[PDB]
Structures are given as C-alpha cells and as structure tokens.
Structure 1
C-alpha cells in the first residue's frame, strides 16, 4: 500500500470555500469553557442516534476535553460553523493528530471525529463542505492522510467490526428498551444470567499509576504490532489516553488497570475502558445509560502464540474488567470485534449488537484488513490480527 496522491504544498488554498448564506467558519478554542460548552450543546442534541431514535451519544465535556486536546493537538483542527446573526454553533468537524502503522508502514495522520450538523441544517450538502475544509486545514499543517470511523458505508472501508454489549445492570437496560426479556424468561432469570462476582481474580491487578507508563508503553506497542492496522503510541499518548488525572479532571473518563506480577513485580498485563453515556431520548424511568467501552489492553501471554493460553488469560482479565466496570456503576460494557476480542466476547456473555463500525483511510491505499468477524458477521478467531486501533 501507499498514498494515493501527493499534495502540492504550493497549491493549498489559504482561504476557505464559501458557506450557505447566513453561516460562517469559526475555529473553536476548546480551552475556553464557554466554547467547549457550545460544542457539547450541539453534540448533546444533534449527534449520533440509533436507528429507532431511542438513544443519542452523550459525550461529556470532560470527555471532549480529553478526546480533542490530546498530544500534538491544534485548535485549527477544531472546526465550527456559526450562524452569522445569532452566533450559534450549528456544525462541527474535529481532528487530532496521531501516528498509525498500516502493514508496518508508519504514517502521520489526523483522526477525524465529531462531524455534526444541527438537525435543522441537514440534507443541505454541508457535509462535503465541512470535510473539504478540515482537509484544507490539515494540508496546510503538512498532514495528508486521515483515519476515521463511521456507522455508514462509504467508499472503500478498510475494515468493519461488529458491536457487542455486556449487560452490567440488566434491569436498567430492560427498562430503557435496550435489552429484551426473552419470552419464556423472567427478570430474575436475566439478572442471574448476567450476575458477576463481587471480587476480581487476576493476581496483582491494580489501578494503573503514572509510574507504570514506560512499561505499559512497551507492552502495548509490542501487543499492537500483532495487528495490520494499529495506533503507534508515543509515551505522551500513553500518559494522556490511559492515565486518569484526578487533580485536574473532575469527571473521570478513562479507567486503566495493570497486572503487577506477584513474583517479579513486572507489569504483565493491562486493560482500560472509557465512560461514554447515552441520552435515553424518551423514557419516564431513566434519561441516560452509563456505558463503559473496552479500550486498549495487552498481555505477555500473547507472545507465546498459544491461542488457548491467550484465550484463557483474556477470559480472566476481561471478566475482571466487567467486575470493575460494575463497581464503578456502569450499566453496560461495550466492545467491538477488533483486537483479540473474538476470543472472549461470547463466552463472557456479551450480546451481539445491531451496530457495525466501519474503518476508513483517506489518501492511503492498503488491502482490506480482517475485522474479527466472518461472512455471517459473527466473531471468528481466524479473522483477527487486523484492527488494532480503537477510535472514540
């Protein structure tokens, strides 16, 4: 694989294209709490909903702060559209920089996320205008490739992964309409099926600490190298994406746990998950779902290349992740079929979701990458080794 075209730096336009009458471009400054609030107000009412209009992602302000001001970030890549008269923010598209490995070619890219148009401005073809503009701003800073995910099918996906959902509070999920009562069954029986232990089992498991950064960095990079498409983590990115900062982050978004071997005291495993709520759009009993999403993880067991041993170790580690997520009062635990996740999803009672997430590269060609599922869209241990990046 390789780039599709080379961008002529001499010909990148210094001025943005025109917008629909009454609207104008605005760079957002997310260090300004008022502007972070504006973006949150947009996403909270206008961002991704399920096909039944029951739920809407509810990224928190703390989450947006974390997701968008990661190492190397630039305000230029936080793009808004405002109404000229009212000044109201009516659209967004955001990028942050990172490096990816694509079949062991390292690439500098932007991750594109939080593309959003106010419902009242939909179906006006503003999307290609948003895309063209953030493209321009990236080209001006020497970035010519992107990676993104979307639930919609667009030309040439690099992979596709299915969503899986592990009930933690089954009753709540039943009450909000997410989890069914299967027919011959009862509330009690579904609660029993989803019952978790009160304590974790992996010896040496503890919360990640700043002192763990270098060793988690090394382990994660070695583990991620097992995937054709992966995120090439820097130390700063380990710090930012995995180590919660309680003194300056009042609403926690990231949880990370390491396994400190009781004998050697070396870190042999780790896992992490993040907090992303969904608004329950119309329900007298509840107005949000508190979801934990599986993020990055790694284990030394992987490198023996013994599949049964890796499956065993993940079964223990990930059940512990469910236990910890429950203790932190999450309702559900979500994962995709990427990484080695097909090894444990079904046996740990993750239910198959309706959702698929498609992965795309901009201005970069490579062969399709396995996404953890077979042609029936079911988890398959022979279709891993492909997607090693998790996007928010």
Structure 2
C-alpha cells in the first residue's frame, strides 16, 4: 500500500534527483509551456536557513526503491501578523510526481509535515501557492520589465502591442550601461548587521513581515553569484545606506527556435532609508540586465506598487496569494504584505 515518509537535502546524489523532481513537476504555467526550473544550489539557499530541521524535507519514493515521487519543505521562520511576533514556519516545495495517478498522496503528504512541525511547537504555518484557498490573507500579482524584449517577442512569454515595431519596443525598454545612483556597491561581509538593523526598522511597518536575526538577514541577503544579489548604498565617509536584492530563479523553457532558457530575476527585498527608492528599483533593472538577465519580476509590498507601473511593469500571467494555517486575523492590501516568501 502506501503511508510513506523520507528525507532529502545536502548530499549531491540525493539533492540532484530532488531538483530533478521539481525540474519537470512543480509547475505554474498556463497556455504557454514553462515551469520553475530549480537550481542545484538555490534550493540550499532556501531549504537551509538558520534553524532548519532534517525531518521537514519530507520525501516519497515508489514502493520499489529508486523512485522519488514527492516532496515538501518547511523552513523555520518568525512571522509578524497581529500586534504579535509569532514564531511560525514557512512551508514550501509541495510537489507530486507527474504521471502519479494517486490523489490520496498529497492529502497525506500534506498532513505529514503538519505533524512533524507540531512537535516543535510551531503550530502556526506560513506559505503562498499558485492556487485558490478558502481563507486568504493577501493576493499579490507579478510584474515585469523586459531586459531582453526581442527575446520574449521571439518566444511567447511576452509580445508587441498592435503596431509596435520589433525595434521601437526595444528603444522604449532601453537601459543605461551605468547606474544613476552614487554609492551603489556590492554588500561586503561586514555589511551584514547594517542590513539587519536597517531592514528590521524598515520592514517594521507591515502587518506581515519576516523578523530576522543578524544571521538570517545574513543568509537571504549576502551576495552569491547565481542565487541571490544585494547591492548596498554606502554614503560618503560614513556607512549610512539603503539596498536592493533579487534572487535569481530561472524557469525552464520549451518549444523555441534555438533560444536558451530564461534567466529570471525575481526581486527579494529593497530598503531605502528616506531617499525615494524609485531609483533604488531602477538601478536594479540596470543590474539584472548588466548581469545578463531577461526580466526583473517584482511582486507587491507597499512600496512596490509605487515604482512598479510608473516603470515598465505590466503583464500579470496570474496572481500569488498569501495564507495563514492556524492563526485568525483580519486581512490587508498588498501595501501591508511584507513577507516575500519566494
């Protein structure tokens, strides 16, 4: 029969077949043809934060042996909803093999990690999903800004309006070869606590935010070449600053001429002191582009809805929604959502 359990993370041989799963499984595509291709390392950046536990990377193999067919993460967090900071967890990566003809899988594959967590007291859960669910807390929507238009037009991810030449479109979505912000410089190792304290007071204005430690803001922020970026803005002789961050997350491709995948550039967080971030967000586009990216995808967060539309952002394939498992409380607009849980 089946009432299985497992584990997965760290080891090369394992981890690989693991992303193999999500590679051609964890989909959220539509008419077109493409799902989130997951990087070997990236996973570790997300699946291994400070305080993670082995029994939360559940696995599932076919009655046989050499057959992984299911997964689900659950990285430890410390949400902030009501007038309180409830230590909760962020559940993610819930997949099920493709050809699997069993609907009595996830319904157990789900309640399993629920028990596994309810053992450390973390009875509260946090996550988002490319689907609908009864009691939602939020409902954001993705945007863009082609850093390689002729490509999207070439494939089928994006297209030119009515009579828009495959040339003017470019001119429009053009970009300078050098930032228009003086001080923009990659975050050093010693810039960690400066990104912790600077982000804890800032983020400290949203109804739902991920409180982090000097080590956490040290994990989802310190630069890594093919995972996540973060350029701080040091001042003159001092240190005072603001900064931007965008975790790479390329999506697999499909039927195309001879084009490569799709180097994605989703946005993580962005904290400008007082100075308007309408440029802190633009530079990002100049970075993601100068770094060889095809698009900068930014969701909602208060101050996002601002610079968004007043900048080359529009198309919205769909919309991501936020939820809370065992907590009851009122809802808010995108302007209040802080947690950028992938």
Query: What TM-score range do you get, normalising by the shorter chain?
Result: over 0.9
TM-score of the aligned structures, taking structure 1 as reference length:
0.84
Q: 1:112-123 to 2 correspondence within 5 Å?
A: 112-121=91-100
Unaligned runs of 5+ in 1: 1-20, 246-250, 302-309, 372-383
Q: 1:85-104 to 2 correspondence within 5 Å?
A: 85-104=64-83
Q: Is the 8 A contact 1:216 1:267 kept in 2?
A: no
Q: Secondary structure at the match of 2:192?
A: helix
1:109 is aligned, of 64, 67, 88, to 88
Q: For residues 181 and 299 of structure 1, what CA distance do their matches in structure 2 show?
A: 33
Structure 1 counterpart of 2:177 = 198
Offset of 1:23 from its aligned partner? 6.9
Structure 1 counterpart of 2:194 = 215
Q: Does residue 1:391 correspond to 2:341, yes or no?
A: yes
Q: Does residue 1:349 correspond to 2:299, yes or no?
A: no
In structure 2, the CA distance between the partners of 1:124 and 1:110, relative to structure 1 (3 Å rule), is same
Q: For residues 134 and 23 of structure 2, what CA distance do their matches in structure 1 show?
A: 28
Q: Does residue 1:129 correspond to 2:103, yes or no?
A: no
Q: For residues 48 and 100 of structure 2, what CA distance do their matches in structure 1 show?
A: 27
Unaligned runs of 5+ in 2: none
Q: 1:1-392 to 2 correspondence within 5 Å?
A: 21=1, 24-28=4-8, 30-121=9-100, 124-244=103-223, 252-262=226-236, 264-301=237-274, 313-371=276-334, 384=335, 386-392=336-342
Offset of 1:286 from its aligned partner? 2.3
Q: For residues 107 and 209 of structure 1, what CA distance do their matches in structure 2 show?
A: 31
Q: Secondary structure at the match of 2:265?
A: strand
Q: Is the 8 A contact 2:270 2:280 kept in 1?
A: no
RMSD: 1.4
Offset of 1:86 from its aligned partner? 3.8
Q: For residues 216 and 260 of structure 2, what CA distance do their matches in structure 1 show?
A: 33
Q: Is the 8 A contact 1:176 1:280 kept in 2?
A: no
Q: Is the 8 A contact 1:100 1:109 kept in 2?
A: yes
Kindly report structure 1 stretches of 4+ aligned residues shifted beyond 6 Å.
none
Q: Secondary structure at the match of 2:118?
A: helix
Q: Is the 8 A contact 1:166 1:334 kept in 2?
A: yes
Structure number with the higher helix fraction is 1
Q: Is the 8 A contact 1:99 1:108 kept in 2?
A: yes
Q: Deviations over 1:176-227 (max 9, x none)?
A: 2111121211111111110011110111110011111111111101110111
Q: Is the 8 A contact 1:151 1:356 kept in 2?
A: yes
Q: Deviations over 1:109-160 (max 9, x none)?
A: 1111110011112561322211100001001122111100011111111000
Q: For residues 101 and 124 of structure 2, what CA distance do their matches in structure 1 show?
A: 27
Instruction: Work out the number of aligned pairs and report it.
Output: 342
Structure number with the higher strand fraction is 1
Q: Secondary structure at the match of 1:67?
A: helix
Q: Which moved more, 1:281-290 or 1:79-88?
A: 281-290
Q: Deviations over 1:332-381 (max 9, x none)?
A: 0000122310110011211231221100011001101211xxxxxxxxxx
Q: Is the 8 A contact 1:279 1:287 kept in 2?
A: no
Q: For residues 40 and 202 of structure 2, what CA distance do their matches in structure 1 show?
A: 31
Offset of 1:34 from its aligned partner? 1.1
Q: Is the 8 A contact 1:291 1:333 kept in 2?
A: yes
